[PDB]
Amino acid sequence: TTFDDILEHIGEFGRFQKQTFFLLCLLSAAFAPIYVGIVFLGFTPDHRCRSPGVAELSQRCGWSLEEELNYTVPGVGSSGEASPSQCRRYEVDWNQTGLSCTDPLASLAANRSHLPLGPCQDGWVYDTPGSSIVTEFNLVCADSWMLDLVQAAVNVGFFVGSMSIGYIADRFGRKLCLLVTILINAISGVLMAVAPNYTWMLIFRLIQGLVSKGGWLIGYTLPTEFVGLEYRRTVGILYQMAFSVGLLVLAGVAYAIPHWRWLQLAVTLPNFFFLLYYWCIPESPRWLISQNKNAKAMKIIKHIAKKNGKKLPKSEKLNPSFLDLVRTPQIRKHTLILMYNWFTSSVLYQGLIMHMGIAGGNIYLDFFYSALVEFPAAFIIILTIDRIGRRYPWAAANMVAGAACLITAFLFWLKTTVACLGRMGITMAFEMVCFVNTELYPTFIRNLGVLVCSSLCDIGGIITPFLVYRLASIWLELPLVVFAVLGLIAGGLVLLLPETKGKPLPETIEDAENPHR
Numbered sequence: 263t264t265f266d267d268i269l270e271h272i273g274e275f276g277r278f279q280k281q282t283f284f285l286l287c288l289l290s291a292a293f294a295p296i297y298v299g300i301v302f303l304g305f306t307p308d309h310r311c312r313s314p315g316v317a318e319l320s321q322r323c324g325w326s327l328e329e330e331l332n333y334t335v336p337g338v339g340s341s342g343e344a345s346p347s348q349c350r351r352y353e354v355d356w357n358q359t360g361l362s363c364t365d366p367l368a369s370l371a372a373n374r375s376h377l378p379l380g381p382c383q384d385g386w387v388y389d390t391p392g393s394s395i396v397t398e399f400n401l402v403c404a405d406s407w408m409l410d411l412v413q414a415a416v417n418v419g420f421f422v423g424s425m426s427i428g429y430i431a432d433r434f435g436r437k438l439c440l441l442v443t444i445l446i447n448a449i450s451g452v453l454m455a456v457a458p459n460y461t462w463m464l465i466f467r468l469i470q471g472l473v474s475k476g477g478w479l480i481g482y483t484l485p486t487e488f489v490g491l492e493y494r495r496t497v498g499i500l501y502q503m504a505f506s507v508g509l510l511v512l513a514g515v516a517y518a519i520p521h522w523r524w525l526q527l528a529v530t531l532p533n534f535f536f537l538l539y540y541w542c543i544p545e546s547p548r549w550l551i552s553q554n555k556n557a558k559a560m561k562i563i564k565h566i567a568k569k570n571g572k573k574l575p576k577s578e579k580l581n582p583s584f585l586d587l588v589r590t591p592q593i594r595k596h597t598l599i600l601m602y603n604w605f606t607s608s609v610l611y612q613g614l615i616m617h618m619g620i621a622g623g624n625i626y627l628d629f630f631y632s633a634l635v636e637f638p639a640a641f642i643i644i645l646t647i648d649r650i651g652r653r654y655p656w657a658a659a660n661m662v663a664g665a666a667c668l669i670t671a672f673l674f675w676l677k678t679t680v681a682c683l684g685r686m687g688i689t690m691a692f693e694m695v696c697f698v699n700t701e702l703y704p705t706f707i708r709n710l711g712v713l714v715c716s717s718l719c720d721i722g723g724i725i726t727p728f729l730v731y732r733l734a735s736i737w738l739e740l741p742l743v744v745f746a747v748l749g750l751i752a753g754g755l756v757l758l759l760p761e762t763k764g765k766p767l768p769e770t771i772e773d774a775e776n777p778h779r
């Protein structure tokens with residue numbers, strides 16, 4: 263007796279699976295913000311040093327924002343293309359000593375260089391009507407690193423969170439861990455909007471990061487276990503699609519309400535809504551059967567059977583271990599290759615979206631187009647995964663990503679199209695990685711196998727904001743060349759991974775030892 267055969271009689275894809283997947287995929291939307299929400303929660307608008315005298319001078323004569331932009335602000339191009347205008351104040355005696363409206367500073371200095379420069383004090387003025395983290399905490403001139411540090415904190419939380427949560431989930435089931443992660447993520451997200459000081463907000467963001475990705479992956483693994491062999495691709499890829507749709511909705515919601523506090527408070531409301539009603543999904547019977555807890559598994563199977571609409575026919579110790587993950591040489595090889603794939607995926611993904619994307623345009627529209635590019639990738643992957651196997655299309659997608667990045671490295675009209683194509687390729691590679699990794703490991707360590715293998719992803723996220731800079735100074739286009747090298751090498755290494763087309767996912771370590779047999 264095997265789980266697959268029992269599943270066949272109940273029905274690989276039926277009413278129960280439809281309901282479960284429809285409820286589950288919404289969690290993907292709730293995780294869409296945590297990953298890439300810095301783009302909207304914290305954005306840097308055009309800003310200038312506060313000028314108390316300018317306030318008085320504005321009512322003296324007719325003033326316009328564009329007009330006042332130049333004759334009452336330090337000129338750009340001195341000791342930096344934009345350094346003076348950004349966060350340097352002339353500190354002239356504008357108030358009580360106004361020479362004239364046309365040339366208030368012409369008589370004081372008469373020369374851009376002659377005009378004195380000093381530290382940016384009295385605060386800052388931001389053009390955007392909608393506040394944000396940057397405006398809230400004045401992280402503009404001497405604290406630019408702070409905004410990147412927030413994202414680095416999220417990327418650091420993901421790491422430890424995965425490393426612990428994977429072990430906890432694989433030792434005490436998926437359902438309980440998923441519920442706890444959902445609750446902690448919701449509470450941290452909602453409390454973030456009430457952080458009075460920057461430090462507390464950063465700590466709350468770290469706490470939320472510790473749980474977000476772990477919960478997301480634990481939610482991804484479950485539907486694959488529920489579904490049968492034939493329909494695995496559909497659920498596995500439609501999950502990714504929800505993330506895409508979720509990403510798309512978030513763009514619109516961000517345009518709807520700009521105030522970052524309100525944005526965060528609202529965006530996590532679905533996270534709270536899930537907690538109440540997601541306690542109607544059962545624990546995966548595969549884990550119970552593998553863990554020698556068939557008693558509960560039979561009740562779960564009966565519950566599934568009654569809802570499905572078919573009649574069920576009448577008819578030693580396994581524990582997780584980190585060292586076991588590498589005990590088997592073949593498992594060692596698989597894990598190493600997959601970890602390298604994670605690392606080479608995260609760097610490309612984050613770096614290209616933050617930099618590769620076409621410059622200019624609104625904050626929202628460009629992100630919208632970035633989200634839109636992914637939908638074709640899901641379609642192409644769905645078309646060919648079963649027909650020509652998972653291995654070759656994934657390798658080809660990684661190769662295409664690397665090639666597109668390299669050709670972009672060396673009026674940018676072609677650059678936009680190449681960027682979109684590359685942007686497509688990288689998502690294809692990421693999805694393929696996420697799909698294959700679950701199906702490769704044995705069941706009783708799968709949750710521990712993937713999450714730990716995903717920990718290396720975090721390191722890439724930390725490296726990208728730093729590495730690029732060090733490379734960018736060394737040579738203008740060096741980061742793209744390195745990206746291409748990483749992409750192509752990863753695509754080549756992918757070919758070595760054993761193929762899985764019709765093989766049922768293994769439930770023992772020996773089975774994973776020799777996948778060919």
Ligand SMILES: C[n+]1ccc(-c2ccccc2)cc1
Nearest residue numbers: 297475478502505636689692
């Ligand atoms: C298209 N796309 C979907 C999901 C991811 C993802 C990133 C980090 C963790 C989990 C999923 C990346 C790309």
